[PDB]
Amino acid sequence: GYDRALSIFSPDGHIFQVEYALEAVKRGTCAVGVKGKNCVVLGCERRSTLKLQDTRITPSKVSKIDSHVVLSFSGLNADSRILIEKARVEAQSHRLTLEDPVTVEYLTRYVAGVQQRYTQSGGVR
Amino acid sequence: MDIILGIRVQDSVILASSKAVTRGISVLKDSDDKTRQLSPHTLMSFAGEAGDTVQFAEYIQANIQLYSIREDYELSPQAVSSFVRQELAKSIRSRRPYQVNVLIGGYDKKKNKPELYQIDYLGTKVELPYGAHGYSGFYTFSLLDHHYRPDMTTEEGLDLLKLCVQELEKRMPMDFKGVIVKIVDKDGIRQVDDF
Amino acid sequence: MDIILGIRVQDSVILASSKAVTRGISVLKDSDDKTRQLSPHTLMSFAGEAGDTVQFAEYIQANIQLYSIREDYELSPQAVSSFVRQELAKSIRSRRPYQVNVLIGGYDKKKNKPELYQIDYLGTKVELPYGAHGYSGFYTFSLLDHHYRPDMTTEEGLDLLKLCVQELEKRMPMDFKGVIVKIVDKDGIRQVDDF
Amino acid sequence: SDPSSINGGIVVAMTGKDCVAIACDLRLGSQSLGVSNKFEKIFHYGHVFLGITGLATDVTTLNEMFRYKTNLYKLKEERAIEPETFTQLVSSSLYERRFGPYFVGPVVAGINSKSGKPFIAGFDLIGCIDEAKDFIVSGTASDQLFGMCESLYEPNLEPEDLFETISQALLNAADRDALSGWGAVVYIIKKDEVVKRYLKMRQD
Amino acid sequence: TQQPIVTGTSVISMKYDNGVIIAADNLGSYGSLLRFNGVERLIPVGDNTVVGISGDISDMQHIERLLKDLVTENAYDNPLADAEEALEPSYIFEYLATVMYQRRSKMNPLWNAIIVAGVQSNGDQFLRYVNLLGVTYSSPTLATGFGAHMANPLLRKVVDRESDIPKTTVQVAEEAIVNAMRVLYYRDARSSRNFSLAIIDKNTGLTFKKNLQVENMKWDFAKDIKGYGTQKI
Amino acid sequence: QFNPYGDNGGTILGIAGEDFAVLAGDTRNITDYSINSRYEPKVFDCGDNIVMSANGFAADGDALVKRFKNSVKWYHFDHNDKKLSINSAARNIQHLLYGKRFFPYYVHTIIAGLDEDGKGAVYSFDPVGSYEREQCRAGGAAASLIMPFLDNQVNFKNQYEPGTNGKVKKPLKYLSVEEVIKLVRDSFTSATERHIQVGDGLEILIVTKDGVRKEFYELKRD
Amino acid sequence: TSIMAVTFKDGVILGADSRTTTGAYIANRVTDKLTRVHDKIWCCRSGSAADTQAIADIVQYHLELYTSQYGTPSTETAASVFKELCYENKDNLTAGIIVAGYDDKNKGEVYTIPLGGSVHKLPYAIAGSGSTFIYGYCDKNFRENMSKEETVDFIKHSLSQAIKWDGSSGGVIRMVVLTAAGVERLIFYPDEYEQL
Amino acid sequence: TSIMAVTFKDGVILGADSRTTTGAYIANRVTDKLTRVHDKIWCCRSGSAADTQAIADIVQYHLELYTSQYGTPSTETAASVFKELCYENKDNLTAGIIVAGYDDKNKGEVYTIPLGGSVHKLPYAIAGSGSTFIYGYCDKNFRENMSKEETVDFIKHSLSQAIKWDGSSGGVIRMVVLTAAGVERLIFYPDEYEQL
Amino acid sequence: TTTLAFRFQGGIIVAVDSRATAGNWVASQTVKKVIEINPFLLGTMAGGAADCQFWETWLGSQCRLHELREKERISVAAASKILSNLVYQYKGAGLSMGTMICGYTRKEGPTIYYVDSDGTRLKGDIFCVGSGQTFAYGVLDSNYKWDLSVEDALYLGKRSILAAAHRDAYSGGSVNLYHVTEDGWIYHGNHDVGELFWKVKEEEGSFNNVIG
Amino acid sequence: TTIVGVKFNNGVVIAADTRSTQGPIVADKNCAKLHRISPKIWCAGAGTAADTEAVTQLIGSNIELHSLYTSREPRVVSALQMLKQHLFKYQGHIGAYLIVAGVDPTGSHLFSIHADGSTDVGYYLSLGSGSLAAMAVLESHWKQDLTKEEAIKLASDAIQAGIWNDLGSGSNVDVCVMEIGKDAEYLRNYLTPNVREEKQKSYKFPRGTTAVLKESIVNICD
Ligand SMILES: [Mg+2]
Ligand SMILES: [Mg+2]
Ligand SMILES: [Mg+2]
Ligand SMILES: [Mg+2]
């Protein structure tokens, strides 16, 4: 298997590949989350250099992970699908074994854990 | 386990499933629901080897729920039944096969038709107006051959089912402790509380 | 066959015996009287191998009736029970043994005491305050250990028996279709019609 | 399907000074199900005592058989059978069924009426005589009885002491066997008085 | 899982005051066929240990190779290979015992019973048994197969407990072993007349005797035995 | 077909005092109707004031004892020479046995020592690792002969206070090491009389806060 | 067992080892497998010791009764009686018997009776487990009309080899010489025959 | 099968019958059971034809590879390779093989490898079902340092007898002579050997 | 074994015997067949002593890890399901377990799950499990009402195990009693059948089949 | 069992141990395995205990009736023939393995009978589980022309080999000597090398220890 340590420390203590991943996020369309007294709203910019789009079918920016939890994102779209698919699988696996849907904190911790794992594993960015 | 039936009428599918769970010479439970909702308009009843039954049902349930979330869409009964069959067809040549028989009752919203699928542990699928697994069928199939009509109402279906349960309660050697009855139609899945 | 019970109270012996006869997956009959009057104050209930049961019961019945005519006298329950035991004890080392278990309830007129004898197919005899054959005892013996008293009336006995049947109807896997109950006392043998 | 351990039960016998003791539990079961708490396994024909463990139908049958044979003996011999002689009759009778045997472990105890000697003997199911000065054991807790007796026993115990010894041997052997217990009876036997005592023991 | 084909019968042995004796016949049976007659079943390891093997001969030859290779390995980077770091009998035994139990645990046994006889560097006598199941035990006398039934009773008359060992000379002990070998030849239908014997002594070292024979046999009384009951002539 | 199990006979016995514990076992090792050895010990000092016997199939018993001794060695290496408490030993041994749940060690295992309050402790195991602390336990071939005796003489079962109408039980109390050794010796001589696999010798390991002592007694050799 | 019977010029000689076995244990190392059923009619026994003894005992009884009524029986007659028992009870016997006797009309005769209870009249016969190993040898070395000393040597060498290879066979080599002269018992110990 | 290999003054001779059997049916009456694994290292095959062939084919491959790297292998080496295969796969083989070869240092050598995969170096060796019947004969008639003609006669007579008694053996007697001179194939038809 | 656990007005009763057998050999009379997983969770043991003992203490380790990771006590549903999913992996291998996972949580209330080695998992109000289960059922069922006082409930549980200890040869030794409430579990003593039988006979007037 | 027979100058001697087993349990520690068939024909028996007793008693009975009928002392070959034909008829199902010996008008005789009906003749014989231990001694020490006292020693030594080395054999040595021109001497417990050691403790209980529910006088008279 391809094994290279891609995320590594530099002399100043930074992991440049992680920081460069942040720049990809900074380049992504804006997304915002505001929580009310009795709700949460997720808002998302969609850049307008694209007309002739088909809005029916184009992947929407907010994804349902389970019927009670949603995930939005800024950054590389193709990357986001991988995190969403894993999150959706874990959501069903949690219901199967614990007989209760995920807490938002749990689901977040899982997704966060996946992201961290890709920062100290060989062969991946 | 043992008794699971299904009848498809004009506008709904009705599943009836025995309530007893017996291990040895003891009825451990008389209120067991041998069914899982796979999607809002699809219900699966099941019977077979202890443990295997629920483990399989819940595994299928998890898989269909995952699909629903991923596509924000509900698989047709035909699609679900085909997925289930394939899963069982794999299982039969495994190291340890799932020994579970199932009925899948669903309302297809695109066609506005109810649908009943009978599938045994080998992955043998058939669509039927009425179906059963185990010894049940040896009494009920002949009775439904006689009294069943394709244009029946949900209420006519329930009475037809009451006949089946009456016969089983007369001639079956074991006390299966009555049935839980569920109706699957255009408005989803509901449970008849008095039967 | 399957369920046969017996309770001896102050002034009578009560036998309760299931009504079902099952061959395969069919209950052929739900009103079977698993009992024979051996003499006016002696009743024998029985359960075991199909055919063997009745053949044995009727054979014993014929023998006791013959004795009664020859002596113009009624054998005591103890005497009858000992005759029955010996017959079974012979049988067990035969080419083909009778596979029949019995309860013998009798009222001994010389002692004015009711008597209950439990005898299995090996010819194992015991006199008991209450007895059962088959899986029945696994539920009822513990229950009678608790609620039974030696000075009970026939009516208290019947209620105590209703508890036993209720428990069996809750926990037994098979539908034995209720019981026929018979009382043996100083006035002979009568059948309770509503149970 | 092992006939000697369907019903369960035990018998033990011991000699003392000018006395013998024979004891048995009271259980009769059908495998795990206990059925009767009143099934005595010790019988007597005149002054000769016989205990029998094993298949209960054969226990009953053999009692009825030895009563039959000892009654006829007495009528023809014009005297009660002695234990040495009865022991021989038991052996004859079991070996007669050599290839279709009674599934039993009989034990004989008694005091010879002429010599005054205490006497005990045990038998296998096929009639072999095990004679002993000290003790005989039998039943489903026979291993346990062997262990109790072999440590607890001593010769020439007085009747009141022998009672304690045999009762303790039986009780503690019974409590390590699932198929023995549910009551106990002890017979203390002297030249011309016999005392029967029911023991208090655990009912599980 | 196996069945033994070519087999060796008893290995017998005992301790005496200064050392140990061990013996075994030279036969490789093939069922009831007495097929091979030049088979050495005592294998010396160094000048302080002899390993006697019974049971399957194909597995015995495998063990020979293991022991021969063990010697080679112990010499590697070992300046004291013929001195303080020479192979002890206790080392050789624990190795075989380890292998035997591993093989039984993998359901593929070496179909043998083995006795390791020798003298440790401190002068102590070593005698221990191990078999196909990995079962091990020590005793003043040890024998395999028929030997356990017929030799041990004879050898135990000489050394019945630990305290009898200093009182037993090599002359007495060898007499008993040689006598035991005769008895087994009378009575074991898978034995041969020819055998080997080895003495390991804390003073005289290893003496290995080949091509011995059972002698001084009683057969003369055979002539008087006629019929099986009533026959006179 | 190859049978990977054998039966080496013998029998063992653990009794726990107030400030001591004994673990006894005969020294006879058998297969079928032959004696392999009249003195082959099967009760071992494993360190940290823990004695152990694994009785039944000797090859399995030796492997187990070997592995537990090795477990004790690594417990020291990994936990700063900490003493392995008897309760911790028992639990470790459960995992050793249960690790072979589907190809078990054919042994009844008993260990003895002192608990962490200085009180005598005996633990016994079934072949797959069920374990229980007890005052008293015999294991092996003659366990059925010995155990009911110990119920009577160590825990005073079925013994009542004279005159009390069997209403007051004989009161429980700890026994001296002198009394316990008497009960052990009598247990084994009785067992030797009536069980063919038991005989030759008896070796007792006693455990106090001062360490591990031994005592050996002859048993009948027939 | 290794057994054989050999006709020669003056009569017939029977020979046998002396090993009786129960598994690999030698229950008897000095057995006598050469058995008299009449003055000059003998047999060699192989198979179950119990079966062959019970049979020989019955045959001896029959021939004693034959003798009392009709005089001396022929060797053929003796062999027929053996056969009848062996054939009719073939399901419950393990007996391989060689019958050998001396008439004055018929001289030496050998009949062998294997497991089925068939009868086979032969110049010589070999039987028992050890016989397998000397078919080659015996076929190459047997001649008709040998002398007594030649026949004794043939048997001694043959059984020596059978004993050498068959672990079930062993002990001494017993022989019985049947001629007009009478009946002679010979024995040969290991130290002689082993080193032939 | 009946097979054997015999060392003698000038080298070694291998011999074999030619019968291959499936039950009582003779699948091949002219089989060649003497098989070359090297110029002057040959083997006699008995047991399963498939097993012994598969084995010989593997051994021939090994010795060809040995030869390419280290020169001519010893007969001991060839026997060791046979053993390794037979021993390590003892559960799945029915092969009784005799290995025979000629060195110039070691002259003639014979190693026999029975079912277990043990190795036994011997002056001569016999194997196969037919061998049982000639243990007696061969032990009595074998001498060391025989001449070529004497050895050919010993083998011819021995296998003649094995064939006479063993129904599994039969056909022709093949031999292979291994000496410093080279390799010679001999054959002997029934009409010759049957009436020895 | 005989074990039971029932739900009622005032929480959960759990009662077990203490016998262990090797065939007809009574191996122990003093076995602990209840395992305390946490202050609010109990597990009962029937079948293979080792299997139950080992996997139910293992269960406790898994429950402890759950509350470290989720900062919250595990639900009875989830605890029972860890054990049942574990045994289902071993299905066919020959594990022997009849267990009941009893406990209270805020979200569930008092809850009992039957879990066995064929992989069966059932929520329920009453279960009896073991070789003496039928005897315990007979008594328990006939005297059970939801409204029982804590005092009467404890006795019924104890009396039901007694019933089985008496009749079932493979049950006995002593009774171990537990009560589980909103505040957790409370132990209610070890009750030797030696004394309990005679005490109950006298005080209750039951067990007339027995020579008094 | 271990049993033996040894011939000497003027007669024959037989011996046996005294252990009886049921599996690994010792049922009888002092059972008599030397059986009288007639006054001067004694039989040592191994195998199924009841079978050896019954078959020995039955033939013993028929020998007595024969002796009376013929007005002659019974011969060993008669007992041998009657025993073997009986046992053969039963095809081994009567598990009696017998060493038959005695003196009669014909001389002194020694035979063995297996269960199955096969008989052997010899100067020294052994049967039973301990027969190999015994035979090892007999093969080591037997010679032609033994005295009575030498034969007894050899025989009892052969039984001892069984007692010590065979788990199927133990306790005592019984001997019977049948010399020509003399009464047979049955030496019951000729050796007793397995006397139980003094117990450490008396287990005699305080009177009143055992809880009692009822008493009653039992009537044994008429
Ligand atoms: Mg109980
Ligand atoms: Mg012994
Ligand atoms: Mg193959
Ligand atoms: Mg041919």
* Rounded Cα distance, D106 and D127, in Å: 9
Instruction: Identify the CA nearest to A96 among candidates I85, H51, J91.
Output: I85
**Closest partner residue to C146 among I134, I137, I163, by Cβ?**
I163
SS3 A93: helix
User: Are I162 and I15 in contact, with CB atoms under 8 Å apart?
Assistant: no
Q: Give which of E13, E142, J126 is closest to F31, Cα–Cα.
A: E142
Helix (H) or strand (E) holding H93: none
**Distance separating alpha carbons of residues C54 and C52, to the nearest angstrom:** 6
Query: Which of B134, B125, B130, B157 is CA-nearest to residue B145?
Result: B130
- Measure the CA–CA gap between D80 and D44, rounded to whole angstroms: 11
Amino acid at F81: D
Residue F62 is part of which domain span?
Answer: 1-222
Token output for E86 = 């020479």
Query: J74 near J99, Cβ under 8 Å?
Result: no
SS3 content of chain C, % helix, strand, coil (to 5): 35, 35, 30
Q: How far apart are CA E133 and CA E107, in angstroms?
A: 10
CATH code of the domain covering residue E8: 3.60.20.10
For residue I116, the domain's CATH number is 3.60.20.10
Residues C76, B58: Cα–Cα separation, whole Å: 64
Chains G & J: contacts with CB separation below 8 Å: 27
Q: Chain D residues with CB inside 8 Å of J205's CB?
A: 161, 164-165, 168
User: What is the CA angle A30-A34-A36, rounded to 5?
Assistant: 165
Q: Does I49 carry a binding-site annotation?
A: yes
Tell me the nearest-neighbour CA distance from C100 into chain I, angstroms: 24
Question: Quick one: which of E18, E13, E10, E232 has its CA closest to E124?
Answer: E18
Cα C168 to Cα I87: distance, rounded to the nearest angstrom? 31
Task: Quickly list DSSP for D66-79.
Answer: HHHHHHHHHHHHSS
Cβ count near A47 (within 10 Å): 8
Cross-strand pairs, J47: J96
Token duo for residue G34: 């050469």
Query: What is the phi-psi region of residue I106: left when phi exceeds 0, alpha when psi lies from -120 to 50, beta otherwise?
Result: alpha
Chain H: nearest CA to G169, how far in angstroms? 14
Taking a C-beta distance cutoff of 8 angstroms, is the pair B17, B45 a contact?
Answer: yes
| Of the candidates H7, H56, H3, the residue with the CA atom closest to the CA atom of residue H179 | H7
For residue D203, what are its two tokens? Answer: 């009912």
**What is the span of the domain harbouring residue E232?**
1-233
What distance in Å separates the CA atoms of residue D131 and residue D118, rounded to the nearest whole number?
12
CB within 8 Å: A89 and B69: no
Please state the domain count of chain E: 1
Which stretch of DSSP H or E encloses residue G83? helix G75-88
Q: Compute how many other C-beta atoms are within 10 angstroms of the C-beta atom of residue E196.
A: 20
Residue D182, domain extent: 1-204
Give the C-alpha separation, J50 to J36, whole Å. 15
| C180 Cβ contact list (under 8 Å, min separation 6) | C16, C17, C19, C33, C34, C35, C191, C195
Residues 6+ apart with CB under 8 A from F19: F114, F118, F119, F120, F208, F209
Neighbouring chains to C with at least 3 Cβ pairs closer than 8 Å? B, D, I
Domain count, chain G: 1
In this structure, what token pair is assigned to residue H48?
């399963």
Answer whether J55's CB lies under 8 Å from J83's CB: yes
Q: Which amino acid would we find at residue E23? A: A
Helix (H) or strand (E) holding I105: strand I98-105
Exposed, middle or buried: residue A15 (CB in 10 Å: 0-12, 13-18, 19+)? Answer: middle
* Strand, coil or helix: I127: strand
d(CA B183, CA F34): 74
| Residue H173, strand partner residues | H188
State how far the Cα of H46 lies from the Cα of D204, in Å rounded to an integer: 68
Domains and CATH numbers, chain J: 1-222 (3.60.20.10)
With the CA atoms of F30, F31, F34 and F38 taken in that order, what torsion angle do they form, in degrees rounded to the nearest 10? -20
Cα-based distances in Å from F176 to C79, D148, F26: 60, 22, 22
In whole angstroms, what is the distance from residue D125 CA to residue A121 CA? 76
Distances (CA, A) of B27 to B175, B176, E153: 9, 9, 63
Sequence-separated contacts (24+) of I66-75 with Cβ below 8 Å: I70/A106, I73/I38, I73/I40, I73/I105, I74/I41, I75/A98, I75/A99, I75/A100, I75/I105, I75/I107, I75/I108
**Cα angle E16, E22, E26; round to 5:** 155
Asked whether the CA dihedral J47, J53, J58, J64 is positive or negative, the reply is: positive
Q: Which residues 70-99 of G are in CB contact (within 8 Å) with J?
A: 92
User: Best interface-test mutation with H: which of G131, G138, G139 has the largest number of H CBs within 10 A?
Assistant: G139
Are J161 and J133 spatial neighbours (Cβ–Cβ below 8 Å)?
Answer: yes
Q: Which CATH number is F126's domain given?
A: 3.60.20.10
Q: Which SS3 state, helix, strand or coil, does residue C118 take?
A: strand
DSSP G157: H
Closest CA relative to residue H187, chosen from H11, H63, H30, H60: H30
Sign for the CA dihedral angle at H65, H66, H69, H73 comes to: negative
DSSP D81: P
- Tokens matching residue D11: 């018998």
Region of residue D54 (phi > 0: left; psi between -120 and 50: alpha; otherwise: beta): left
Please list, residue by residue across C127-143, b when 16 or more beta carbons sit within 10 angstroms of its beta carbon and e when fewer do.
bbbbbbbbbbbbbbbbb
Give residue H136's identity as a one-letter amino acid code. Answer: G
CA distance E149 to E138: 16
Burial of F81 (0-12, 13-18, 19+ CB in 10 A): exposed
Q: Which residues contact F173 (CB under 8 A, 6 or more apart)?
A: none
Selection from G174, G193, G46, J12 nearest residue E223 by Cα: G174
Amino acid letter, residue I116: D
Residue I32 in tokens: 């602990």
**Domain covering B1-195: architecture:** 4-Layer Sandwich (3.60)
F152 chain-D contacts, CB cut-off 8 A: 148, 152, 168, 172
What are the strands, taking DSSP E only, across A19-104?
A: 31-35, 40-44, 63-66, 69-71
d(CA G134, CA H136): 5
* Neighbouring subunits of A (3+ Cβ pairs under 8 A): B, I
Instruction: Give the integer Cα–Cα distance in Å for G152 and D77.
Output: 70
Quick one: angle between helices J131-141 and E146-158, nearest 10? 60
Nearest to F7 by CA among F25, F27, F40, F31: F31
Structural domain count of chain D:
1
Catalytic residues of H: 1
Residues J38 and B72: their CA atoms lie apart, in Å, by 104
The answer to whether residues D72 and D23 touch, using CB atoms and an 8 Å cutoff, is no
DSSP state of B11: S
In the structure encoding, which two tokens stand for residue H54, read together?
Answer: 């598969």
For chain I, say whether D202 makes contact (Cβ under 8 Å): yes
Q: How far is J136 from chain D (nearest CA, A)?
A: 31
Selection from F18, F54, F20 nearest residue F131 by Cα: F54
Distance CA I132, CA B155 (A): 46
Positive/negative CA dihedral, J141, J147, J150, J151: positive
CA distances from J96 to J1, J48, J114 (A): 12, 6, 7
| CB A94, CB A69: distance < 8 Å | no
Spatial separation of the C-alpha atoms in residues J169 and J74, rounded to whole Å:
32
Task: Kindly list the domain boundaries of chain C, sorted by start residue.
Answer: 1-195
Torsion of the alpha carbons at D170, D173, D177 and D181, rounded to the nearest 10: 20
Rg (CA), chain B: 16
Nearest to H179 by CA among H8, H10, H4: H10
Distances from the Cα of J142 to the Cαs of E188, J84, J128, J136, in angstroms?
18, 27, 19, 10
Structure tokens of E58? Answer: 């194909």
Q: Three-state DSSP class for I156?
A: helix
On the 0-12 / 13-18 / 19+ scale of CB atoms within 10 A, H141 is middle
**I83, containing H or E segment:** helix I76-89
Distance CA A52, CA A45 (A): 17
* CA D163 – CA C46 distance, rounded (Å): 43
**Both tokens assigned to H110:** 């014979």
**Residue D10 near residue D3 (C-beta atoms within 8 A):** no
Task: Name the experimental technique.
Answer: X-ray
Q: In chain D, what residues touch I24 (CB-CB under 8 Å)? A: 5, 8, 140, 177-179
Total number of domains constituting chain F: 1
Task: Extract the tokens encoding J89.
Answer: 């008829």
What CATH code is carried by the domain that includes residue G153?
3.60.20.10
Cα-to-centroid distance, F3 and ligand 3 (Å): 25
Task: Concatenate the DSSP letters of all residues of D19-41 into one string.
Answer: EEEEEEE--EEETTEEEES----
Chain-centre distance of CA I35, in angstroms? 9
Write out residues 136-175 of I within 8 Å (CB-CB) of J: none
Contacts of A45 (CB under 8 A, 6+ apart): A29, A30, A31
By CB atoms closer than 10 A (0-12, 13-18, 19+), residue E141 is buried
Distance from the CA of H90 to the center of ligand 3, in angstroms? 10
Domain of D159, CATH number, reads: 3.60.20.10
Considering only CA atoms, which of G122, G117, G48 is closest in space to residue G82? Answer: G117
Q: Provide the number of structural domains found in chain I.
A: 1
Helix (H) or strand (E) holding H178: strand H173-179
How far apart CA F89 and CA F50 sit, in angstroms, is 8
Contact B173, B43 (CB under 8 A): no
What's the CA gap between F157 and F154, in Å, rounded?
8
Q: What are the DSSP calls for chain J, one per residue? A: --EEEEEETTEEEEEE---EEETTEEEESS---EEEEETTEEEEEEESHHHHHHHHHHHHHHHHHHHHHHTS---HHHHHHHHHHHHHHTTT-S-EEEEEEEEETTEEEEEEE-TTS-EEE-SEEEESTTHHHHHHHHHHH--SS--HHHHHHHHHHHHHHHHHHBTT--S-EEEEEEETTS--EEEEEEE---PPPPPSS---PPTT-S-EEEEEEE----
Alpha-carbon Rg for chain C in angstroms: 16
> Contact I16/I100 with Cβ under 8 angstroms?
no
